[PDB]
Amino acid sequence: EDDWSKPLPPSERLEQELFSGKYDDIPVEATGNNCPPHIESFSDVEMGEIIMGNIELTRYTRPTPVQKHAIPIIKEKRDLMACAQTGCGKTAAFLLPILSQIYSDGPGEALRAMKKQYPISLVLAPTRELAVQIYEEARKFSYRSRVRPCVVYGGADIGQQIRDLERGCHLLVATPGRLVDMMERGKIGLDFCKYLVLDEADRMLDMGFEPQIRRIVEQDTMPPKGVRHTMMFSATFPKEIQMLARDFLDEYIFLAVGRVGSTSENITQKVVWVEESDKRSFLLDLLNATGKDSLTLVFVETKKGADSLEDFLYHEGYACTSIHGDRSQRDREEALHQFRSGKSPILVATAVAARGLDISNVKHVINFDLPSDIEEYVHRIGRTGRVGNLGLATSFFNERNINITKDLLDLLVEAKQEVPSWLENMA
Ligand SMILES: *CCC(=O)NP(=O)(O)OC[C@H]1O[C@@H](n2cnc3c(N)ncnc32)[C@H](O)[C@@H]1O
């Protein structure tokens, strides 16, 4: 056999690519059954030489707020549910303890008795942006060790990632759509996946990734809850998340960084009454007031509506593309790149045709048409806003939306947003 706790020979050729290169502290509310209290320094918990050596190389000093509490929790083989939007070091909060256990316990007898890749740990992410950030920090801490990480994501060459996987992966970072695609090709097996991490689970649900995430976790060879160690990270906490955290976690601990609640902030919501005849006019005025290069996403409810609306905006001179299924994958994936960088800063789309597509973080979401469920509305307006700047979500309301009047109202009050006075007088 072999050993996975002794650092391998270094290579000065490799330090160059990895270590070439912030707030303070904020309140925590760690509610859990019999959880271990946090730590103050990395030297407190004996994580391992391969980790400690790599910690120095990136000039890591003190563990961040979430890293103080989450790190001792994970290495104690306890499921975690961390809800923290204004928390720095959310990604390294799980990488250090997970990799510390893999270096200690080893890969397990199943892998060493072998010579389709079976990764030990799996990290799910919503965006290609966040997937690579986790992957590049994984490389930073898997250096000088026998763990090789791999990343896959949608909207890229699948053949080059397959060639990357076959080179051997133990810690895989993936978006849910591309991971399911790898599994159907017999390239990835979750049989020996011990550590599961769902990073930014809220934004993963807003993009329509749940059927994949449940296909990955609940409908394959993924070891069951209790056998695997599962962590979750998210900013919001709707009914969708707590139900998901109930199915995916076994007797977990809840972490909180100050402001913790459903309906992410940094998103200003405006609701206006617009009859169907005036939606075109109202949208035009809404676009004439738009910033110079502010990216805008316009949801509609049908395929015919999305085509007719995109035709409207093009005949008015606005640079806009569309995605609505009736245009094949050659035009849809082209619309992303055209929208991801100027060119067509107005993307008309439907709720279904945007499922799992990494929209380039829009600045203004416009619900030209409204759905029939308040949970879909949370998904759609979740396409805007980040951990930093403030976003905008305008929604056109009329008599076709009495169904969601009460739910939209209470949602606005919970989000501390302005409430149209007539909306109260409709419930
Ligand atoms: C508030 C910051 C945030 O929201 N996330 P982040 O900026 O992506 O934080 C991770 C980046 O900062 C570096 N990092 C993470 N943790 C530490 C510690 N403890 N010391 C020094 N640097 C840290 C990571 O390298 C990552 O780039």
Numbering used by the authors: 133 to 153, 162 to 255, 264 to 575
Question: How did the manuscript describe this experimental structure?
Answer:
Named for their conserved Walker B motif consisting of adjacent aspartate-glutamate-alanine-aspartate (D-E-A-D) residues, DEAD-box proteins are required for all stages of RNA metabolism including transcription, processing and splicing, export, translation and decay.
To better understand the binding of AMP-acrylates to ES DEAD-box proteins, we solved the crystal structure of DDX3 (132–607) S228C bound to AMP-acrylamide to 3.0 Å. AMP-acrylamide can be fit unambiguously to its density and clearly binds cysteine-228 through a covalent bond. The significant flattening of the P-loop observed in this structure is likely due to the torsion placed on this flexible loop by the tethered small molecule as it moves to maintain hydrogen bonds within the Q-motif. Interestingly, this distortion of the P-loop breaks the electrostatic interactions between the phosphate and the P-loop backbone, which are typically thought to drive nucleotide affinity. Nonetheless, we expect the reordering of the P-loop observed upon binding of this compound to strongly antagonize the closed (active) conformation of DDX3.
